[PDB]
Design an enzyme around this catalytic site. Structure first.
Site, PDB file in Angstrom:
ATOM      1  N   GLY A  96       4.324  -6.754  -4.559  1.00 52.95           N
ATOM      2  CA  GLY A  96       4.301  -7.389  -5.867  1.00 52.95           C
ATOM      3  C   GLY A  96       4.204  -8.906  -5.770  1.00 52.95           C
TER       4      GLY A  96
ATOM      5  N   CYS B 282       5.683  -4.543   1.704  1.00 55.13           N
ATOM      6  CA  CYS B 282       5.968  -5.936   1.352  1.00 55.13           C
ATOM      7  C   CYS B 282       7.121  -6.048   0.362  1.00 55.13           C
ATOM      8  CB  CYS B 282       4.705  -6.610   0.810  1.00 55.13           C
ATOM      9  SG  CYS B 282       3.425  -6.734   2.080  1.00 55.13           S
ATOM     10  N   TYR B 283       6.831  -6.406  -0.887  1.00 52.97           N
ATOM     11  CA  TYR B 283       7.886  -6.511  -1.893  1.00 52.97           C
ATOM     12  C   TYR B 283       8.706  -5.224  -1.875  1.00 52.97           C
ATOM     13  CZ  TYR B 283      10.216  -6.741  -6.455  1.00 52.97           C
ATOM     14  OH  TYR B 283      11.137  -6.732  -7.478  1.00 52.97           O
TER      15      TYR B 283
ATOM     16  N   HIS C 138       0.385  -5.161   4.656  1.00 54.80           N
ATOM     17  CA  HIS C 138      -0.323  -4.219   3.798  1.00 54.80           C
ATOM     18  C   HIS C 138      -1.203  -3.257   4.583  1.00 54.80           C
ATOM     19  CE1 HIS C 138       0.609  -5.901  -0.226  1.00 54.80           C
ATOM     20  NE2 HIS C 138       0.666  -7.067   0.392  1.00 54.80           N
TER      21      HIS C 138
ATOM     22  N   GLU D 264      -2.678  -0.754   3.495  1.00 58.02           N
ATOM     23  CA  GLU D 264      -3.739  -0.261   2.620  1.00 58.02           C
ATOM     24  C   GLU D 264      -5.039  -1.096   2.590  1.00 58.02           C
ATOM     25  OE1 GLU D 264      -1.004  -1.807   1.764  1.00 58.02           O
ATOM     26  OE2 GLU D 264      -1.154  -2.818  -0.174  1.00 58.02           O
TER      27      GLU D 264
ATOM     28  N   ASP E 236     -21.483  10.350 -12.516  1.00 54.77           N
ATOM     29  CA  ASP E 236     -20.276  10.728 -13.241  1.00 54.77           C
ATOM     30  C   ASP E 236     -20.639  11.622 -14.436  1.00 54.77           C
ATOM     31  OD1 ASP E 236     -17.439  10.579 -13.678  1.00 54.77           O
ATOM     32  OD2 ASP E 236     -17.810   9.149 -15.299  1.00 54.77           O
TER      33      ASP E 236
ATOM     34  N   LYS F 254     -14.322   7.413  -8.445  1.00 58.39           N
ATOM     35  CA  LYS F 254     -15.756   7.666  -8.410  1.00 58.39           C
ATOM     36  C   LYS F 254     -16.173   8.539  -7.225  1.00 58.39           C
ATOM     37  CE  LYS F 254     -19.479   6.022 -10.422  1.00 58.39           C
ATOM     38  NZ  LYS F 254     -19.100   4.591 -10.519  1.00 58.39           N
TER      39      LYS F 254
END
Lengths: 471, 463
Positions: free
Chosen positions: B51, B78-79, B160, B162, B217, B331
């Site tokens: 955050g 992290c946060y 992080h 990710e 889509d 997607k």
């Protein structure tokens, strides 16, 4: 003195340039030049250029028959080689270039070349039989007669272009020929300089010479020549407000430091006012030109009289209006030289590399780099973007590795186009294959430091079919 | 299923995607959600996102205190690692950037052996781990890079995993899932089965209306409905602002696959409606109004229709009853369902194309002449990219026509975080070929340029 007989080749001028780069003064004459006219210059050798037409084409320039009979050494290139075969008892048989490797290259003409010898072959027509007594000195896989040579080694013909970059070892071939032709090398930079100083002195004498200075190496070197020659003169720098950031100060500071009598004219408002509302490029150039002669003429009148008007007319120009009250005698010291030769004089005359190695800048300056009406705000934005582009190029050492680099502002709120090109034949220009990391750094710095610019692009268009400048 | 508690990080959505890429379903909930709403999802593990605030900021998002005792395996990022340390007896002080983990150990770093670059968060720092916890990771400058609880069920990382800047991040998250015993419940065959079942029971025998644009889509929404046996009317509104040959390719493919398609020729409407407008904003607004007018017209003319099917996606979530079966998908997952539904690669792997189509790719007023010039240039750019295998190697490729007599801007980008976009570093030889091919086949175009602007600071589309 080597005469380049012009039979129409797009490379005729380039040949004349290689001979200068080989310390042989060269002059160009039409292919069908009468024997007398070609002999009047007392040339040491003749080089017959290529040509777009065939040796059979009725409308094909023919030399003066008596030409081939002057003990004068000869080098026929393509069309020139063919005229050699045809007009001396050889056989020629039946328009595009192409790369090829010489599978054989012997004799004095190829003395020194080893390894692969790639040549830029012409594919219109072919010599299938060398003149009686002559020998075939070169060939490619597809052409058994790539080069011919007379038995006394005075005349040579080659089926390729040794003057173009596509024949990397061409300059060595040209060298061999000059030696073989006994051509003396009296066209060295120090000789030219001494010669030009001499002429300027005698010509102008005690009289005064007026001249325009733009910041380009040509006019800058011209000013230094007059000043060095000790001739009375006035160099006029018209500041039309369409210059690069800091250019005026840079030019005036250096030329004054080297002793040229300089007058800087502040005509920024004059030009801007005259350009208001004008978007048409051809209009911009006409107006700019007009405003320039007017400001220049005013100088000539107030600071007159002036007997001579010196201009940096170059040899390529020779190969190609002031008011009534004013009348001068043209003084064109560089009319027989190529730019790079002038750039060398500049070195001999002491011009610092900062002004000696810069890219060309057009007369209309930044006005032709703004797509649409030229306003002060647009010029302000463009100047900052241009200044950043130029500076980054220098930091990475890429500035000297491109022939031209400019920025174009397109109002849309602005898109800036970076434009750089490189060249190998001095006629065509390819968009510069610059490192992508450099282009990324240029774009980020520009959009970051110049908030008005919201997008930066790079021109991917070559010459042909587009022009270097955008308008 | 793995739940992601959102504490404000710009990467929260990214954490969710990564988990899907590890074949684990995931959902995002506010970091402050009560332990009741968290548990109703029956999570096998929990991840606390990073955050922008400090765990000391009075307005810093706070999790439900009972959460750290729920017994659920958790990973605080992290946060998130800060919360963990603080709310359990650890010490946190006020202290991103690439960094190398000089030390790592335990199940969370299984298989990581060698150089481990991590994308560090420097807002705050854990100075001392909770009582009994171990410091399993370190950086030359941060003695506490990651921590691990004694029961081996909770973990915190000061970086992080990710983001791409943490190359081996996916393996770390993979290790976490393996530790926590998370079941790989996110496979496309299961998802599809679920969706077919869901749409069939919601639609029943009622009629479902849906707009098809040619985009994967909307094309996949159509195939789902058709495969479910649902009574539908897929409306393809040909606004004349599409790429060359698109309408013919889309309708031929969808109809051949079973969709009940209705193509509408509204070229004149849009063209006429667009006369003289240059303002990019007006263009989009106008085109949006015109689409609604054409779609509504078909709606009133047929059916009637009870449901309106839209391809709303999860990032979107982050007279009719809506039917958005893809609201929890990304997607790429829809492109995957399209595979399962038999959509041929030709219409399954295309770059996104905007509703306004080519109108937003002409710097100025949209006229048929400019549309025909641009359309041809675009087609050439596209084919060259496909011929060279570069098409699938960029996230987007488009061409913008600028009146000068026209200058054409080639524009391509790549992305690593599905938020930022870099101008694509394409081969210069390819750009040269595209420029030469375009100026040669499209005489009206006298100059070709390449966009060197990334996002930020600019948008992918020019307007």
């Amino acid at each position: 003195m080597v005469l380049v007989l012009d039979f129409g080749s797009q490379y005729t001028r380039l040949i004349a340039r290689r001979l200068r780069e080989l310390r042989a003064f060269s002059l160009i004459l039409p292919g069908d030049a009468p024997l007398e006219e070609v002999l009047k210059h007392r040339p040491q050798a003749l080089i017959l250029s290529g040509g777009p037409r065939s040796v059979f084409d009725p409308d094909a320039p023919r030399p003066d028959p008596r030409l081939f009979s002057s003990g004068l050494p000869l080098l026929g290139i393509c069309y020139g080689m063919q005229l050699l075969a045809q007009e001396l008892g050889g056989r020629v048989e039946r328009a595009e270039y192409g790369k090829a490797l010489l599978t054989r290259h012997e004799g004095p003409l190829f003395r020194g070349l080893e390894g692969e010898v790639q040549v830029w072959m012409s594919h219109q027509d072919a010599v299938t039989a060398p003149p009686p007594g002559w020998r075939v000195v070169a060939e490619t896989e597809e052409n058994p007669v790539a080069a011919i040579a007379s038995p006394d080694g005075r005349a040579y013909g080659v089926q390729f272009h040794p003057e173009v970059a596509h024949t990397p070892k061409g300059m060595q071939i040209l060298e061999n020929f000059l030696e073989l032709a006994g051509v003396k090398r009296d066209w060295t930079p120090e000789h030219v300089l001494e010669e030009l100083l001499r002429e300027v002195r005698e010509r102008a004498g005690k009289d005064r010479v007026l001249l325009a200075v733009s910041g380009g190496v040509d006019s800058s070197t011209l000013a230094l020549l007059l000043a060095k020659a000790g001739v009375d003169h006035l160099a006029v720098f018209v500041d039309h407000g369409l210059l690069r950031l800091g250019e005026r100060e840079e030019v005036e500071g250096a030329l004054r430091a080297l002793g040229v009598n300089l007058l800087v004219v502040d005509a920024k408002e004059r030009f801007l006012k005259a350009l208001k509302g004008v978007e048409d490029p051809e209009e911009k150039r006409k107006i700019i030109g007009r405003e320039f002669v007017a400001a220049f003429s005013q100088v000539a009148r107030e600071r007159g009289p002036f007997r001579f008007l010196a201009q940096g007319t170059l040899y390529p120009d020779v190969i190609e209006g002031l008011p009534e009250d004013l009348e001068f005698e043209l003084l064109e010291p560089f009319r027989l030289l190529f730019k790079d030769e002038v750039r060398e004089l500049a070195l001999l005359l002491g011009l610092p590399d900062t002004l000696r190695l810069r890219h060309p800048f057009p007369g209309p300056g930044l006005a032709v780099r703004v797509l649409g009406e030229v306003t002060e705000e647009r010029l302000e934005i463009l100047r900052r973007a241009d200044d950043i582009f130029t500076s980054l190029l220098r930091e990475w050492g890429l500035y000297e590795k491109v022939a031209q680099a400019l920025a174009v502002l397109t109002p849309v709120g602005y898109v800036l186009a970076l434009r750089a090109v490189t060249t190998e034949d001095f006629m065509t220009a390819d968009w510069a294959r610059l490192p992508l990391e450099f282009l990324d750094e240029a774009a980020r710095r520009i959009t970051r430091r110049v908030p008005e610019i919201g997008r930066v692009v790079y021109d991917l268009t070559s010459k042909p079919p587009a022009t270097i400048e955008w308008e």
